[PDB]
């Protein structure tokens, strides 16, 4: 087509989605991790994660307001990834890289799994 | 902080939100324009428009599944702007610029209003 494009549009949208999350506006699901609860927007979770995409496209699960993750999932690893989903920023540290990579593999967040693999390989 | 950032994350999220819109997945509102109906996600509309932000933060309106726009709003102008919201791409043409600017002013989409004003000024 002959469209023009606003360079900062996608970033501004994500920033506003994160402001709605902060203020708990229009959040429609609770993600339960080892008895730690995280409120989010189903559409943002689906846009970021192959696991959430599969869950919320399921005819029965699409209607659930609570999703319980596998007990092996670490709440801090989940929190870091949820923050990444809403900001593009990943708080990757020596002390959390293993939990973050394991959580990203479970959530099916391929780009996160990729940078974790590379950061681990650099330290060996 | 000491975060790393994935450059394409915001764009990939918006692309996935637009794929959900295309497939009518988890859309939660119908926007009615001069008897033309547009399905969308309330959170994306709020992230893009000052008008939708005000509407869906209202304690009564946040629960509506149908929103009727002012009858002076042109459905094509709305369609072009809804496409912009989900893609960052604006189909701005000599034949639609007046309707697009009027719709962007009503929807409170300041960056769109800005480029319309500049494109109009260049033609005078």
């Amino acid at each position: 087509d002959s469209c023009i494009q606003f360079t900062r549009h996608a970033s501004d949208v994500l920033l506003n989605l994160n402001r709605l999350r902060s203020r708990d506006i229009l959040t429609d699901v609770v993600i339960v991790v080892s008895r730690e609860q995280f409120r989010a927007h189903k559409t943002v979770l689906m846009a970021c994660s192959g696991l959430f995409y599969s869950i919320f496209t399921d005819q029965l699960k699409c209607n659930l307001s609570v999703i319980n993750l596998d007990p092996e999932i670490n709440p801090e690893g989940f929190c870091i990834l949820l923050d990444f989903m809403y900001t593009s920023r990943l708080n990757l540290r020596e002390g959390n890289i293993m939990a973050v990579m394991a959580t990203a593999m479970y959530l099916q967040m391929e780009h996160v799994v990729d940078t974790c693999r590379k950061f681990i390989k650099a330290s060996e | 902080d000491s975060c790393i950032q994935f450059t394409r994350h915001a764009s990939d999220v918006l692309l996935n939100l637009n794929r959900l819109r295309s497939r009518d997945i988890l859309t939660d509102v119908v926007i009615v324009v001069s008897r033309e109906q547009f399905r969308a996600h309330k959170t994306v509309l709020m992230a893009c428009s000052g008008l939708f932000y005000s509407i869906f933060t209202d304690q009564l309106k946040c629960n509506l599944s149908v929103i009727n726009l002012d009858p002076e709003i042109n459905p094509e102008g709305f369609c072009i702007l809804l496409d912009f919201m989900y893609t960052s791409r604006l189909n701005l043409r000599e034949g639609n610029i007046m309707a697009v600017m009027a719709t962007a002013m009503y929807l409170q989409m300041e960056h769109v209003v800005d480029t319309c004003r500049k494109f109009i000024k260049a033609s005078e």
Binding site: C3, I4, Q5, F6, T7 | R89, L90, T115
Partner: peptide, 4 residues
């Protein structure tokens, strides 16, 4: 704004 840019030409994409």
């Amino acid at each position: 704004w840019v030409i994409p």
